[PDB]
Every structure is written in structure tokens, then in C-alpha cells.
Amino acid sequence: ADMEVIELNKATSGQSWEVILKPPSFDGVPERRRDPSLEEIQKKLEAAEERRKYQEAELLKHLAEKREHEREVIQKAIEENNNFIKMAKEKLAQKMESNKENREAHLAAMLERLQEKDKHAEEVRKNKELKEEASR
Amino acid sequence: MREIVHIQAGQCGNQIGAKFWEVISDEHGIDPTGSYHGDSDLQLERINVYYNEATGNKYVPRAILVDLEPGTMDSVRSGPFGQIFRPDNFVFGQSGAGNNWAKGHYTEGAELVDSVLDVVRKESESCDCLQGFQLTHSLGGGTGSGMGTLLISKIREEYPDRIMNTFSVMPSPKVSDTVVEPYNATLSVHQLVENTDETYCIDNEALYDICFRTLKLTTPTYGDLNHLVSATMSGVTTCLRFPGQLNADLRKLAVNMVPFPRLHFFMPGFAPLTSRGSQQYRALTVPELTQQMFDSKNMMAACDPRHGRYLTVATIFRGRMSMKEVDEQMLNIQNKNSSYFVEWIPNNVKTAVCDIPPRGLKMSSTFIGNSTAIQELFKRISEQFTAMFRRKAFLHWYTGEGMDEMEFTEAESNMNDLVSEYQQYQDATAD
Amino acid sequence: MREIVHIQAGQCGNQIGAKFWEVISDEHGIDPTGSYHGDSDLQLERINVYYNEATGNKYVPRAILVDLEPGTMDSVRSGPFGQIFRPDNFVFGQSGAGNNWAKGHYTEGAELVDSVLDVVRKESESCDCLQGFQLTHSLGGGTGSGMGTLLISKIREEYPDRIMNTFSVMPSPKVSDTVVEPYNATLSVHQLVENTDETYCIDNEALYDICFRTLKLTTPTYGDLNHLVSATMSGVTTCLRFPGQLNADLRKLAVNMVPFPRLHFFMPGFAPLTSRGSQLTVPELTQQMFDSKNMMAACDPRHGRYLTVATIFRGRMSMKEVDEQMLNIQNKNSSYFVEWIPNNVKTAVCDIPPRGLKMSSTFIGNSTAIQELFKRISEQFTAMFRRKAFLHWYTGEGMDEMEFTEAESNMNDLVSEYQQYQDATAD
Numbered sequence: 001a002d003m004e005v006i007e008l009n010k011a012t013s014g015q016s017w018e019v020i021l022k023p024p025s026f027d028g029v030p031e032r033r034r035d036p037s038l039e040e041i042q043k044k045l046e047a048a049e050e051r052r053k054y055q056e057a058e059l060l061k062h063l064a065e066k067r068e069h070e071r072e073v074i075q076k077a078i079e080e081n082n083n084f085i086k087m088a089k090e091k092l093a094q095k096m097e098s099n100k101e102n103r104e105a106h107l108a109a110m111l112e113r114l115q116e117k118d119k120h121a122e123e124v125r126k127n128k129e130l131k132e133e134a135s136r
Numbered sequence: 137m138r139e140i141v142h143i144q145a146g147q148c149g150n151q152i153g154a155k156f157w158e159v160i161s162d163e164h165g166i167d168p169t170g171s172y173h174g175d176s177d178l179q180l181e182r183i184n185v186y187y188n189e190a191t192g193n194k195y196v197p198r199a200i201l202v203d204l205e206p207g208t209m210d211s212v213r214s215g216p217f218g219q220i221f222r223p224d225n226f227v228f229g230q231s232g233a234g235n236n237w238a239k240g241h242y243t244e245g246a247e248l249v250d251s252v253l254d255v256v257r258k259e260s261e262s263c264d265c266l267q268g269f270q271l272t273h274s275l276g277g278g279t280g281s282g283m284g285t286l287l288i289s290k291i292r293e294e295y296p297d298r299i300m301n302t303f304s305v306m307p308s309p310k311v312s313d314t315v316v317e318p319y320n321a322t323l324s325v326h327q328l329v330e331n332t333d334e335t336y337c338i339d340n341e342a343l344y345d346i347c348f349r350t351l352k353l354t355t356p357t358y359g360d361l362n363h364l365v366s367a368t369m370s371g372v373t374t375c376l377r378f379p380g381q382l383n384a385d386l387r388k389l390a391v392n393m394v395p396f397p398r399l400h401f402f403m404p405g406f407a408p409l410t411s412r413g414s415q416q417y418r419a420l421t422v423p424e425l426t427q428q429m430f431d432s433k434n435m436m437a438a439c440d441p442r443h444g445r446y447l448t449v450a451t452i453f454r455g456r457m458s459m460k461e462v463d464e465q466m467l468n469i470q471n472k473n474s475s476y477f478v479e480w481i482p483n484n485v486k487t488a489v490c491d492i493p494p495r496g497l498k499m500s501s502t503f504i505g506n507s508t509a510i511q512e513l514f515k516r517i518s519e520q521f522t523a524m525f526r527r528k529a530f531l532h533w534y535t536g537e538g539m540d541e542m543e544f545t546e547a548e549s550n551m552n553d554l555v556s557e558y559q560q561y562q563d564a565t566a567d
Numbered sequence: 568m569r570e571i572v573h574i575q576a577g578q579c580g581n582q583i584g585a586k587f588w589e590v591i592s593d594e595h596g597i598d599p600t601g602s603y604h605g606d607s608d609l610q611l612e613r614i615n616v617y618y619n620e621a622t623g624n625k626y627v628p629r630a631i632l633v634d635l636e637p638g639t640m641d642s643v644r645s646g647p648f649g650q651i652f653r654p655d656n657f658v659f660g661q662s663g664a665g666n667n668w669a670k671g672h673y674t675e676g677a678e679l680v681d682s683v684l685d686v687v688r689k690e691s692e693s694c695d696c697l698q699g700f701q702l703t704h705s706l707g708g709g710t711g712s713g714m715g716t717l718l719i720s721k722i723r724e725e726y727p728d729r730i731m732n733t734f735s736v737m738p739s740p741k742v743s744d745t746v747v748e749p750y751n752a753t754l755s756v757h758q759l760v761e762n763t764d765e766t767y768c769i770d771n772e773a774l775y776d777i778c779f780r781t782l783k784l785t786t787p788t789y790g791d792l793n794h795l796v797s798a799t800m801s802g803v804t805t806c807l808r809f810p811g812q813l814n815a816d817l818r819k820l821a822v823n824m825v826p827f828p829r830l831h832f833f834m835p836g837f838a839p840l841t842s843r844g845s846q847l848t849v850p851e852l853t854q855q856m857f858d859s860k861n862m863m864a865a866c867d868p869r870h871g872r873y874l875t876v877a878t879i880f881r882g883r884m885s886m887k888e889v890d891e892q893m894l895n896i897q898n899k900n901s902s903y904f905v906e907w908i909p910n911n912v913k914t915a916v917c918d919i920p921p922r923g924l925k926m927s928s929t930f931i932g933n934s935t936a937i938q939e940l941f942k943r944i945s946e947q948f949t950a951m952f953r954r955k956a957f958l959h960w961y962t963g964e965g966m967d968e969m970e971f972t973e974a975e976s977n978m979n980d981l982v983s984e985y986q987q988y989q990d991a992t993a994d
């Protein structure tokens with residue numbers, strides 16, 4: 001319902017003052033937190049560094065497991081190949097031996113049949129002597 | 137965060153990798169002898185990201201060329217830009233991978249992997265500030281797939297604080313080299329979910345359909361498909377290579393594009409879609425370029441963006457155009473197609489504008505999207521995988537290398553878990 | 568598999584054996600002095616199978632001539648090719664076998680057998696790769712029959728891994744030298760069943776009827792009969808002697824011709840049938856395989872079923888025509904081939920025809936019809952054995968009646984086995 005110009009300061013480069021249109025509707029004035037120390041700051045920064053270091057370490061640990069699996073695959077492929085070679089070697093050895101035994105047995109039985117005939121021929125000729133010169 | 141170490145593995149890896157180097161060398165004014173002959177200082181501001189500076193003001197790709205088969209790297213050496221590569225950076229074996237992930241990951245590949253790491257170490261140790269690694273490979277074969285993922289995990293162990301970025305090409309029966317592709321891709325996806333920070337899903341099914349349906353090519357070749365790949369790879373790397381507004385590195389891309397660690401498979405998109413013989417077009421305005429971000433026909437992954445929701449999008453506009461028009465048009469697409477963006481990631485679309493257009497084009501737009509619709513690509517691979525795995529068809533080729541049936545079961549469930557996670561966020565509402 | 572050691576035993580054995588050597592020497596271009604004078608390199612490619620190469624580019628039959636009677640080998644020595652044989656290879660006794668199997672097998676023959684084995688050993692030890700033995704003998708007599716079978720069993724003991732092949736001539740009353748031929752033949756068949764790998768049945772009943780009925784010879788001699796034997800023996804051995812086409816040997820013949828070990832008695836067949844002075848189409852030659860009139864064993868092929876057949880065509884002829892014609896006979900006469908031995912007929916073609924013929928065909932058949940030959944000998948044997956007629960001729964040499972009983976039942980068992988496979992169907 002009026003105005004009030006209140007001179008503040010006048011210096012070489014300018015002037016300043018306060019203009020009050022209306023005073024406050026409340027006279028009795030209005031109706032920071034320490035610190036943080038260097039130690040507190042260092043603690044927060046170092047805790048974050050250790051979390052980052054943990055994350056990276058755990059990611060390298062995962063990759064290390066992969067290298068282990070890769071070596072395990074290669075080794076499995078070696079093992080499977082070696083088992084194939086050994087089973088083929090043994091099965092072949094068995095076939096070649098079973099076959100030698102069978103072939104030997106066939107020939108053995110054949111010669112025994114012929115040997116029986118030779119024993120019978122001796123008996124035939126012996127039987128002839130029991131008849132011939134024995135009677136007249 | 138300046139240098140990127142590029143690695144190309146296997147047949148596909150080296151084909152798309154060589155095409156990337158031919159295209160970006162042309163943009164940067166580098167000829168096949170490594171000499172600069174351009175007329176813009178923007179072309180050399182960030183050359184250091186992909187090229188090493190050699191004596192006699194020449195530039196050499198920071199590229200490592202890997203394969204278990206010697207043949208492919210002879211084809212590279214004889215190519216247009218074949219002479220530009222460091223000869224010591226060619227790491228080739230003599231017995232291939234026989235399109236078997238197990239051979240690439242555990243047998244032939246495991247024997248060559250240390251020779252590759254020696255070359256990566258030499259490149260990486262020379263870097264002022266290593267950003268990370270960019271790998272090109274296919275997931276359908278043996279070397280790119282098996283050996284590429286073995287390289288990833290070995291690089292992850294040696295450089296855990298560096299970004300691992302891949303351009304992984306997905307198999308399709310429409311362009312198939314081998315019957316065992318679904319096994320190879322599943323075993324790889326499992327590795328990518330765990331060991332990469334960001335992957336660009338280059339789907340051969342999507343590339344085939346672009347050529348056939350859009351470009352009307354009755355019988356498209358690998359050359360036709362690779363034209364789309366090189367255009368995408370150039371677009372997607374624009375902000376790593378050229379100065380402007382955001383700077384941009386592989387970590388910044390990862391941070392802003394990946395809200396959940398496992399969900400790091402990007403669905404790239406490009407406009408305009410051209411063929412090699414397409415020497416016109418007399419086409420595409422700013423509103424037209426912006427509209428192609430929801431167009432399934434422009435996606436490099438065989439997924440419909442309209443079947444999911446975008447978690448995040450990064451968009452590159454290339455050429456002389458109104459940056460004000462781009463901003464207006466991009467906001468319009470978000471306001472009109474609001475239901476295809478996740479509401480719980482505020483302002484999830486970022487736009488970049490580069491004055492330099494790619495070769496043969498006066499204006500282009502590339503979209504890098506982290507969409508829940510990418511689950512369609514993983515569901516497709518899983519269906520193919522189970523059709524075969526149910527019958528244990530071709531399994532002896534893997535178990536013969538020492539693998540267990542268990543690894544197949546684990547990779548399959550990890551890919552199905554990836555699918556369920558994309559679904560979880562597609563249904564998730566802001567509450 | 569190269570060298571064959573040929574043995575000829577007894578009157579019949581040495582007669583047919585000499586005729587074999589005369590015929591094959593002519594085919595191979597070998598003259599009675601052992602010199603080659605032919606105009607084909609095919610004649611000498613496989614000469615090594617039957618001939619030893621002697622100094623002065625000469626060829627000597629790998630032949631052993633055996634007999635208990637000295638007379639026959641004097642007749643051989645004086646014959647056309649008599650001088651071609653190694654003189655030390657003639658092993659002869661002085662007291663014959665008196666057409667008694669017991670004398671040949673146990674008495675006179677047993678005393679000469681070691682002298683023969685010494686000569687077989689010398690021939691066999693010199694061989695690079697011994698195929699085996701080829702024996703010519705009759706089953707009706709005593710030397711060829713008794714001593715021949717004793718030789719077989721003794722060679723079987725010393726060379727068990729070698730093939731034993733025989734050309735055994737069956738007796739007939741139509742051409743008979745002795746009344747005891749059924750006993751001699753039965754005692755021999757028993758030995759052949761057990762100790763040979765393959766036997767060619769040369770039946771005198773069949774040879775007599777060919778001469779009499781077909782050749783219209785009122786009174787045929789052994790010369791007339793032996794003309795048919797030499798033609799057959801030449802035909803049947805063609806693939807052992809000549810290049811191609813196939814590289815036949817005696818074991819290969821045994822393996823492919825004999826499905827059951829005891830059933831190794833072949834019924835030979837030949838076309839055309841000619842007399843000892845005569846100087847036909849592919850379909851005509853092929854048709855003679857079912858013709859009973861062309862069989863060297865007195866059996867009708869149409870009364871049994873063929874287990875296996877090996878056929879030789881000789882002369883300049885279309886090999887395509889032979890193949891077509893042979894398939895035709897199998898399709899038209901399917902009921903005379905056992906269905907449970909797939910593709911059981913094999914054909915060979917030789918450019919060289921036999922002497923006096925421009926085209927010939929020989930059939931080696933393993934037919935169940937051969938039981939007719941064994942049934943015939945068994946009926947004759949039983950007629951005699953039932954009455955114990957002439958038995959003292961045998962028991963006098965030390966033999967037992969038991970050996971007769973055993974040989975008889977072994978031959979009847981052979982007959983039942985042929986019947987078993989004749990009635991056997993593919994199920």
C-alpha cells in the first residue's frame with residue numbers, strides 16, 4: 001500500500017539498494033551436517049574399488065572354468081580315440097587266434113581220419129596172413 | 137578411447153570384413169596402397185580409430201585376418217584392397233573346420249588360437265587407448281562360429297576392461313552352405329550372450345528376402361547379400377569414424393543401447409535399399425528415410441519391429457540434409473508409433489547426422505535398434521535346432537570332437553531364456 | 568595257383584590219360600619230342616599248368632604213369648606221344664591187380680604206393696604254386712580203383728591244402744571186363760566221397776550208348792569210347808589251360824561248383840558228338856545241355872535239378888549270342904535249376920576250338936540227376952552182395968564183409984542227399 005527505497009551501497013562501478021513493497025507476514029524469523037572426513041571418503045572409494053575388483057575376479061574365475069572344460073573336451077576326444085584303437089586291437093587279436101585254432105582243428109581232424117584208415121589197412125594185411133600159409 | 141582392433145574369421149567373416157575395408161577406405165580417401173587422396177579434412181580426423189599410421193604418410197587397417205582354411209585369405213590378398221593389409225596379420229591354418237563348430241572351438245581352432253592372440257596382442261599393445269574389438273564372422277559354419285567364439289572368450293580373459301563388438305551373420309536355409317547350421321548357430325549364440333557387449337545381427341534370411349522381394353533379384357548371390365552388409369557396416373560405424381556432436385566410442389554405444397547385459401543383440405536397418413547395378417535412384421527425402429525405421433522390409437534381421445517394442449534406438453542420417461527436418465521427422469515417428477517404444481526408458485531414440493554420404497548414395501539412413509522383436513530370429517534358430525536335435529542327427533560329428541550332448545541342451549536352454557527375457561520386457565509396462 | 572600234377576593209374580587210367588596228353592599237346596602245339604610248333608601265343612601262356620619246361624625249349628608233361636601190370640605202360644611208351652613222358656615217371660609193378668579192388672588197395676598196390684609217392688613228391692616239390700592233383704582211373708578194375716583211391720588218401724595226408732580232382736570211369740555191363748565191377752566201383756565211390764574235392768563222372772554206360780545209338784557203331788571198342796572221353800577232358804580243362812577270362816583254377820572250380828562237400832560228382836556233357844574220323848550253331852550247342860543224349864554220365868538232366876553249371880564254348884563265335892542263348896535256356900528250363908543258388912550258370916568262351924571241330928560246347932554240371940548213376944551201381948552191388956557172390960576174392964585179401972556194408976550205406980547216403988536237395992524249395 002506504498003513503497004520503501006533503502007540505500008545499501010555506492011561504489012565506483014555502481015550502486016545498490018533494497019526496495020520493500022510490503023513487510024513480512026511473520027516477524028519471528030524463519031519457521032549443515034559434518035563432515036565428511038578424508039578417512040570416510042577414502043573408505044567409500046576403497047570399498048567401491050574392492051567391489052569392482054571382486055566382480056572382475058569372479059568373471060575371470062568363470063572364464064578359468066571354461067579353459068578347464070576346453071582341456072577336458074580335448075582329453076575326452078583323446079581317450080575315446082585311444083579306447084577305439086585298443087578295443088579294435090583286442091577284437092582283432094581274438095578273431096585271428098580263434099581262426100588259427102579252428103583251422104588247426106580242421107586239419108587235425110582230417111589227418112586223424114586218414115590215420116584211422118592206415119591203422120585199419122595194417123589190420124586188413126594182418127588178417128590176410130591169418131588165412132594165407134595158415135591153411136592148405 | 138581411440139583404437140579399434142578388427143578381427144575377421146572364417147570364409148563369411150573375411151568376405152564381409154574385406155568389403156567393410158573397401159567401403160570405409162573409399163569414404164576416408166584411402167587407396168589400396170594405403171595412400172590418402174581425398175579432399176576433406178573430416179576424412180582424416182578420426183582415421184586413427186581403424187587405421188594405424190605407417191611410414192610415408194600411409195594408413196594400414198588395424199585388421200587381423202583369421203581362417204583354418206588357407207584358400208580364403210589368398211582370395212582376400214588378390215581382392216581390390218588385398219595389398220592394404222599387414223602381411224603378418226594374416227593367421228591361417230592348413231586343415232579347415234569342416235563346417236563343424238566343435239572343430240573350430242575345440243580341435244583345429246584351439247591349435248591356431250594362440251597364433252591369433254599373439255597378433256591381437258601386438259596390435260593392442262601398440263594402441264594409445266584401446267576401445268576394444270570388432271569381430272566379423274558367420275554363426276552357421278565352423279571357423280567363424282567355433283573359432284570366432286573361442287577367440288572372443290580368450291580375448292575376454294586377456295582384456296576384460298575392453299568392449300567386445302561382433303557383426304554375426306545368421307544362417308538361413310534360403311542361403312545354406314551346410315546341413316549342421318542350426319547346431320553351429322545355437323552353440324555360438326550361447327557364447328555371444330555370455331561374452332559380447334554388443335552384437336549386430338546380420339541375418340541372411342533378411343538379406344535374401346531384401347534381394348528377392350524388394351530388389352526383385354530372382355537368384356541372389358553372396359555378392360548381392362554382401363552389398364547390403366557393407367552398406368549397413370559403414371552406416372553403423374559412421375559415428376565411431378567421423379567427427380561430430382557426440383564423438384562416440386564402443387562403450388558409449390553399449391552404455392546407451394544396452395539396458396540389461398544379456399539383451400545386447402541389435403537389429404540393424406538401412407534406407408535406401410539398392411542393388412549393385414542400381415545406378416539411379418532419384419529418390420528418398422528426410423520423411424521417407426525416417427519412415428523406413430518401422431519397415432520390416434528395411435531390417436537386416438528377419439524380424440518385424442511392429443511385433444515387439446524398441447528398448448533403445450540409435451539413428452544415423454548421412455548426406456547434406458536439414459538437421460531440423462530430421463529432428464521433426466524423428467519426433468513425429470515416435471509420437472505416431474508410440475506403442476512400439478518402451479515407455480519406461482525416457483527419450484530412447486538418439487539421432488546423429490553426418491555430412492558425408494556413403495558411396496553411390498546422396499542420402500542414407502541407418503538404424504541400430506534394440507528391439508524385443510529380435511526374439512523372432514532366436515525362435516527361428518531354436519525351431520531348426522530342435523527339428524535336428526530331437527532326432528540326434530549329425531551329433532556324432534560333435535561328440536567325436538569330445539563334446540557332450542549336455543552342451544547342446546545348455547546352449548538351447550540359454551537361447552530360450554534369452555527369448556523369454558525379450559518377452560518379459562515386451563510385456564513390461566511403466567507402473 | 569599254377570602247376571597241376573597229373574596221375575594216371577591202371578589200364579583205363581593210362582589209356583584215357585595218354586589220349587588226354589595227345590589231344591592237349593596238339594592244342595598247345597607240342598609234338599611227341601616235346602617241341603613247340605604252333606602259331607599262337609595263347610597256346611603257351613598257361614603251358615606251365617600241365618607241362619614242365621625242359622632244357623632246349625622243350626615241354627614235358629607233369630605226368631606220373633602208374634600200373635601194377637607192366638604191359639599197359641609198354642603200350643603207352645610205343646604210342647603216338649609215348650616218348651614225350653619223363654621215363655622216371657613210369658612206376659610199374661610186375662603182378663597185376665586181377666580186377667580186384669582189395670589187391671590194388673591193400674596188397675599189390677600197397678607195396679608199390681611208396682615208389683609212386685616218391686615220384687609225386689619230386690614233381691610237387693619242384694612246383695612254384697601247386698594247384699593240386701588230377702587223377703585218371705576206372706572204378707571197375709583193381710589198380711585204377713583200389714590203388715588209385717589208396718594214392719588219393721596217401722596224397723591227401725601229405726598235401727591236405729591241395730585240390731584233389733579225379734576223372735573216374737564208371738563201369739557198365741554193356742562194356743564189361745569183370746563180374747565184380749559193382750563191388751570195385753562201390754568201394755571206390757566210398758573213398759571218392761570222402762577224399763576228393765571234385766570228380767568228373769565218366770560213365771561207360773553213357774559212352775556205350777552214345778557210340779551205339781547215336782554214332783550207330785554196332786560193336787564199339789575202347790578206342791571209340793575214349794574218343795568221347797578225350798573230347799570231354801579237353802573241354803572240361805579248357806579254362807585251366809587257356810588265357811581268360813576269369814583265370815580259372817581247380818580251387819575256384821571247387822568253390823563255385825560244390826555247395827555241399829560230399830556232393831562233388833560232376834555230370835559232364837559235350838556237343839557235337841562225333842566218331843574217330845568226322846572232318847553247328849550257338850543256339851544248337853546251348854540246347855544240348857538238357858539233352859540226355861549228350862551226357863557223359865547215364866542220367867537224364869530233366870530227372871533232377873542243376874545245383875550249379877559251368878559251360879565252355881570253344882571256337883570263333885559271337886560271345887553276345889552265347890550270353891543270349893544261355894539265358895534263354897535258363898528262362899525256358901527254370902524248373903531244372905535249383906532256385907536257392909542265384910545265378911548258378913557260368914559261361915566261358917575260348918577262341919581255340921578242339922581238333923577236328925570248328926565249334927564245341929562242354930557242360931560241367933552238378934545235378935541231382937547223378938543219383939541215377941549211384942542208384943544203378945547200388946542195385947548191381949546189392950544183387951551180388953545179398954548172395955555174397957565173389958566175396959572170397961576180397962576177404963581172401965584180408966578185407967571184412969563190414970567194409971562192403973559201410974561203402975554201400977555211404978553210397979546210399981550220397982543218393983539220399985542228392986534227393987534232399989532235389990526236393991528242397993526256396994522258402
Ligand SMILES: Nc1nc2c(ncn2[C@@H]2O[C@H](COP(=O)(O)OP(=O)(O)OP(=O)(O)O)[C@@H](O)[C@H]2O)c(=O)[nH]1
Nearest residue numbers: 137380381382383384385387388389391392483486
Ligand atoms: N550448454 C552446453 N551443454 C553441453 C555442452 N557439452 C555438453 N553439454 C551437455 O552436457 C550433457 C553431457 O555432458 P558432457 O559435459 O558432454 O560430458 P562429460 O562430463 O565431459 O563426460 P562423458 O559423459 O564421459 O562424455 C548433455 O546434456 C549435453 O547437452 C556445451 O558445450 N554446452
Ligand SMILES: Nc1nc2c(ncn2[C@@H]2O[C@H](COP(=O)(O)OP(=O)(O)OP(=O)(O)O)[C@@H](O)[C@H]2O)c(=O)[nH]1
Nearest residue numbers: 568811812813814815816818819820822823910913
Ligand atoms: N567295375 C568293375 N568290376 C570288377 C572289375 N574286376 C572285377 N570286378 C567285379 O568284382 C567282383 C569280383 O571281385 P574281383 O576284384 O575280381 O576279386 P579279387 O578282389 O581279385 O579277389 P580274388 O580273385 O577272389 O582273390 C565281381 O562283381 C566283378 O564283376 C573291374 O575291373 N571293374
Ligand SMILES: Nc1nc2c(ncn2[C@@H]2O[C@H](COP(=O)(O)OP(=O)(O)O)[C@@H](O)[C@H]2O)c(=O)[nH]1
Nearest residue numbers: 146147148151274276277278279280307311358
Ligand atoms: N552373407 C554372407 N553369408 C555368407 C558368406 N559366405 C558364407 N556365408 C554364410 O556363412 C555360413 C557358413 O559359414 P562360412 O563362413 O562359410 O564357414 P567358416 O569359414 O567355417 O566360418 C552360412 O550360413 C553361409 O550362408 C558371405 O560372403 N556372405
Ligand SMILES: Nc1nc2c(ncn2[C@@H]2O[C@H](COP(=O)(O)OP(=O)(O)O)[C@@H](O)[C@H]2O)c(=O)[nH]1
Nearest residue numbers: 577578579582705707708709710711738789792
Ligand atoms: N572207357 C574206358 N573204359 C575202360 C578202358 N579200359 C578199361 N575200361 C573199363 O575199366 C574197367 C576195368 O578196369 P581196368 O582199368 O581195365 O583195370 P585196372 O588196370 O586194374 O585199373 C571196366 O569197367 C572197363 O570197362 C578204356 O580204355 N576206356
Ligand SMILES: C=C(c1ccc2c(c1)c1ccccc1n2C)c1cc(C)nc2ccccc12
Nearest residue numbers: 375384389392448449450451483484486487488
Ligand atoms: C552414442 C550413441 C548413442 C546410442 C544410443 C543412444 C544414445 C547414444 C542416447 C542418448 C540420449 C538418449 C537416448 C540415447 N540412445 C538410445 C550413438 C548414437 C548414434 C545415433 N549412433 C551411434 C553410432 C556409433 C556409436 C554410438 C552411437
Ligand SMILES: C=C(c1ccc2c(c1)c1ccccc1n2C)c1cc(C)nc2ccccc12
Nearest residue numbers: 806815820823875876877878910911913914915
Ligand atoms: C571258375 C569257374 C566257375 C565254375 C562254376 C561257376 C562259376 C565259376 C560261377 C561264377 C558266378 C556264378 C556262378 C558260377 N558257377 C556255377 C569256371 C567256369 C567255367 C565256365 N569253366 C571252368 C573250367 C575250369 C575251371 C573253372 C571254370
Ligand SMILES: [Mg+2]
Nearest residue numbers: 382383384388
Ligand atoms: Mg565428454
Ligand SMILES: [Mg+2]
Nearest residue numbers: 813814815819
Ligand atoms: Mg582277382
